[PDB]
Amino acid sequence: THKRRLSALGPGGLSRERAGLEVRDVHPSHYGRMCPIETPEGPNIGLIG
DNA sequence: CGCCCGCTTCGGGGCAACCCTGCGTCTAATACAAATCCGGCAATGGAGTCAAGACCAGGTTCG
Questions:
Q1: In this complex, which protein residues place their C-beta within 7 A of any atom belonging to strand B?
Q2: A28 near A22, Cβ under 8 Å?
Q3: Which family does it belong to (predicted)?
Q4: Shortest CA to C1' contact from A14: nucleotide
Q5: At residue A39, what are phi and psi to the nearest 5 degrees?
Q6: Are A6 and A26 in contact (CB under 8 A)?
Q7: CA of A14 to C1' of B14 (A)
Q8: What HEC string does chain A produce?
Q9: CB neighbours of A46 closer than 8 A, spacing ≥ 6?
Q10: Which long-range contacts (CB under 8 A, 24 or more apart) does A40-47 make?
Q11: Nearest-5° angle of CA A13, CA A14, CA A20?
């Protein structure tokens, strides 16, 4: 699970303080491409899948 | 009846305060003088050391 892990942070990506609230939610296109369950539950919810 | 002219009202601009869309190897020496380290004898002179050796004073033993 450390492999096959999809993030949105890092270089070339948005910062944590600049993270919009809408990019943390589950779009309905995620069905089959990203898990809507497994994610860190700190101040990183939805930024890492 | 129309007209100027500053007074107020909003716009736009301008500016001040915080993050990363941020985050290269380079002529090459010589010549000389001054300062400084340092290595090694070369005077020590005072401070420690051994040993003899004397100094009685009061237990201790002997008469």
A1: A 11-13, 15, 17-18
A2: no
A3: Belongs to the RNA polymerase beta chain family.
A4: B21
A5: -165, 155
A6: no
A7: 29
A8: CCCCCCECCCCCCCCCCCCCCCCCCCCHHHCCCCCCCCCCCCCCCCCEC
A9: A23, A24, A25, A26, A39
A10: A43/A16, A44/A16, A47/A7, A47/A8, A47/A9, A47/A16, A47/A19, A47/A23
A11: 145
Residues across chain A = 49
Resolution of the coordinates, Å: 3.4
* Experimental technique: cryo-EM
- Between the alpha carbon of residue A42 and those of residues A12, A28, A29, A33, A48, the distances in Å are 22, 23, 24, 23, 11
Nucleotides of strand B lying closer than 7 angstroms to a protein CB: 19-21, 23
